[PDB]
């Protein structure tokens, strides 16, 4: 309400064109090579040869003023793992204005006056390409400014930095905003931005979380990178407690096998998700949807099913197995639900076959004619006290163009 009312620029894909739907009619010129609406309706990709977007504002409503800028961004590995500084959004016409820069795993917002003097807010999104970092992951950015002279930086609704801006003087805002990288770049160096908005007020933490919660699309399951999960797409599924292990069948019992090369992310047996009630090929998976899992193992497709008999040693614990006969079988139907978290894109997996179970990974003796131990994904009953266990969190890693190897 009050939030939407203060929007003076809102870049959205309407026809098959990126336009300003704030009502203020800014002119938006998109380069011919720029790809729009590839992951999210209102996203655009900056990868192509010097491709860019120019926004010429047609108003004069808007440093010592109240304003906010928000958008989501996803930066590829090759671009984050570079020592060069890249300007991606620029308002600086002459010497004053603002700009967003990328450099060595850090994202930086700069506000400078005519004398080349500047102040900034910085955030290390890529620890060191760490699993816990945001390299090639969608994350929400928000920058606010107030007449008090403070500019703040929020990431996924969390305040990261605050800065007093009295050191600077003459800072006039340009009527032009240019998206794009001017520096020469390589093939796999790319980034995506979605839902770029500018507000004529300083959004409060409450306001920001409302924007964040509304644009993350809570009912759409997410893959590891933050893209919406899709049917008929291959995924490497990993458990949050064993990020260095991939799912694999031993003696028709799925177990978590350690990666041969700990740096190679795409390791294992790809799993494709199928919809029980057929829809459209690669359509989005919503929470509560019934799904079936197919694993590609040695060039053959198998359906993952829950074992009917419990493993000896809550109450019941069942191992997962593979079945060559594909089709709709209750024992192979699962349900997925996103986990609420600002640090990860994970989900929990449930089965309501004969008893309500939730998938978890832990140490067990899954076999019948053996006492061998193994880290194994299991479907367990009475999981009420397990809802917060990280051992119940699963990540779906897809082959993403922003992470090549």
Swiss-Prot record:
What's the reported outcome of changing residue 362 to A? Significantly decreased binding of heavy chain (HC) to synaptosomes, whole toxin is significantly less neurotoxic. Dramatically decreased HC binding, whole toxin is dramatically less neurotoxic
Pinpoint motif Host ganglioside-binding motif by residue range.
381-384
Q: What is the effect of changing residue 367 to L?
A: Significantly decreased binding of heavy chain to synaptosomes, whole toxin is dramatically less neurotoxic
| Ranges where the record places region N-terminus of receptor binding domain (N-RBD), Hcn | 2-218
Region C-terminus of receptor binding domain (C-RBD), Hcc, as annotated, extends over 219-405
Annotated consequence of substituting residue 373 to A: Significantly decreased binding of heavy chain to synaptosomes, whole toxin is significantly less neurotoxic
Q: Where does N-acetyl-beta-neuraminate bind?
A: 308-309, 321, 368
The organism's superkingdom is given as: Viruses
Q: Where is this region: Ganglioside-binding loop?
A: 364-374
How changing residue 364 to W affects the protein? Increased binding of heavy chain to synaptosomes, whole toxin has half neurotoxicity
Query: Where is it located?
Result: Secreted
Provide the effect of residue 391 to F.
Decreased binding of heavy chain to synaptosomes
Q: Explain what the record says happens when changing residue 369 to A.
A: Significantly decreased binding of heavy chain to synaptosomes, whole toxin is dramatically less neurotoxic. Significant decrease in HC binding to GD1b, GT1b, GD2 and synaptic vesicles, GBL is well ordered in crystal
Q: What does the comment on domains in this protein's record state?
A: Has 3 functional domains; the translocation domain (TD) and the receptor-binding domain (RBD) which is further subdivided into N- and C-terminal domains (N-RBD and C-RBD, also called Hcn and Hcc). The N-terminus of the TD wraps an extended belt around the perimeter of the LC which occludes the catalytic pocket. The belt region may be a pseudosubstrate inhibitor which serves as an intramolecular chaperone for the LC prior to its translocation into the host cytosol.
Q: What does this protein do?
A: Responsible for host epithelial cell transcytosis, host nerve cell targeting and translocation of light chain (LC) into eukaryotic host cell cytosol. Composed of 3 subdomains; the translocation domain (TD), and N-terminus and C-terminus of the receptor-binding domain (RBD). The RBD is responsible for the adherence of the toxin to the eukaryotic target cell surface.
Q: What is this protein called?
A: Botulinum neurotoxin D heavy chain
Q: Which gene encodes it?
A: botD
């Amino acid at each position: 309400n009050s939030i939407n009312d203060s929007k003076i620029l809102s870049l959205q894909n309407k026809k098959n064109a990126l336009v300003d739907t704030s009502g203020y009619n800014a002119e938006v010129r998109v380069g011919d090579n720029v790809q729009l609406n590839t992951i999210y309706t209102n996203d655009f990709k900056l990868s192509s040869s010097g491709d860019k977007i120019i926004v010429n504002l047609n108003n004069n409503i808007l440093i010592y003023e109240n304003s906010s800028v928000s958008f989501w961004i996803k930066i590829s590995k090759d671009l984050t793992n570079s020592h060069n500084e890249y300007t991606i959004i620029n308002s600086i016409e002459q010497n004053s204005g603002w700009k967003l820069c990328i450099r060595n795993g850090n994202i930086e917002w700069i506000l400078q006056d005519v004398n080349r003097k500047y102040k900034s807010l910085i955030f290390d999104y890529s620890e060191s390409l760490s699993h816990t970092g945001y390299t090639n992951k969608w994350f929400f950015v928000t920058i606010t400014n107030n007449i008090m002279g403070y500019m703040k930086l929020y990431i996924n609704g969390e305040l990261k930095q605050s800065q007093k801006i009295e050191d600077l003087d003459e800072v006039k805002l340009d009527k032009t905003i240019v998206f794009g990288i001017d520096e020469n770049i390589d093939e796999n160096q790319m980034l995506w931005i979605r839902d770029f908005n500018i507000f004529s007020k300083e959004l409060s933490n409450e306001d920001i979380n409302i924007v964040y919660e509304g644009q993350i699309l809570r009912n759409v399951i997410k893959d590891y990178w933050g893209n919406p999960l899709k049917f008929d797409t291959e995924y490497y599924i990993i458990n949050d407690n064993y990020i260095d292990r991939y799912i694999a069948p031993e003696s028709n019992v799925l177990v978590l096998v350690q990666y041969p090369d700990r740096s190679k992310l795409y390791t294992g047996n790809p799993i494709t998700i199928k919809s029980v009630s057929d829809k459209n090929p690669y359509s989005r998976i919503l929470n509560g949807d019934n799904i079936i899992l197919h694993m590609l193992y040695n060039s053959r497709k198998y359906m993952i099913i829950r074992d009917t008999d419990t493993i000896y040693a809550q109450n019941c614990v069942y191992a997962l197995k593979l079945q060559s006969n594909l089709g709709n079988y209750g024992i192979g139907i699962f349900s997925i639900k996103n986990i609420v978290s600002k640090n990860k894109y994970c989900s929990q997996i449930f089965s309501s076959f004969r008893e309500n179970t939730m998938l978890l990974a832990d140490i067990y003796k899954p076999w019948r004619f053996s006492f061998k131990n193994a880290y194994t994904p299991v479907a367990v009953t009475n999981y009420e006290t397990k809802l917060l266990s990280t051992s119940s969190f699963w990540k779906f890693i897809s082959r993403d163009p922003g992470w090549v190897e």
